[PDB]
Amino acid sequence: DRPFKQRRSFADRCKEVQQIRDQHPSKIPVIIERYKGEKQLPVLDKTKFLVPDHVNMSELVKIIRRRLQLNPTQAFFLLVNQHSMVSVSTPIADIYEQEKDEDGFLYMVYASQET
C-alpha cells in the first residue's frame, strides 16, 4: 500500500517517464493515489495511468469516479497539488507542463473531501 515514490527511486521514476515518452509519446504519465487519511473511498485497482494528452481534466475526474464504482451520493474529489480538478475543462497536456513533478510524472490524489 506504499506510495509510488516509496516504491521507486527518483532515477527509476525518471527512466520510466522517458520510456513512456518513447513508447506512448501522446500520453501523459499520471500517478493517481488515494489520500493518506481517506476513510470512505476504496483503494483503486491501479495507480499508473497513461492519459491521452487531449483529455480534459474534468473528464479524467468522471473517469476515475466511474472506476471507483460509487453511488451518486458519495463525495469524490481528484486533486493535483491540492487543486480540485472537477471544473477544469483544460486538456491534461496543458496542466502537465505546469504541474508535473521533477521526475516527469503528474501526481494526483483523490479523497472524499476537498479540504
Residues that bind ligand 2LZ (CB under 6 A): 49-52, 55, 60, 63
* Shortest Å distance, C-beta 115 to ligand 2LZ: 24
Q: Are 54 and 91 in contact, with CB atoms under 8 Å apart?
A: yes
With respect to ligand 2LZ, which residue has the nearer C-beta, 49 or 105?
Answer: 49
Distance CA(12)–CA(77), nearest Å, equals 29
Position of cell 513533478? 101
With respect to ligand 2LZ, which residue has the nearer C-beta, 51 or 88?
Answer: 51
Q: In what order do the strands lie in the sheet with 106-111?
A: 48-52, 27-34, 106-111, 77-80, 83-84
* Shortest Å distance, C-beta 51 to ligand 2LZ: 4
* Shortest Å distance, C-beta 67 to ligand 2LZ: 7
DSSP for 86-101, written as a single string: SS--SBHHHHHHHH--
* Shortest Å distance, C-beta 47 to ligand 2LZ: 11
With respect to ligand 2LZ, which residue has the nearer C-beta, 14 or 55?
Answer: 55
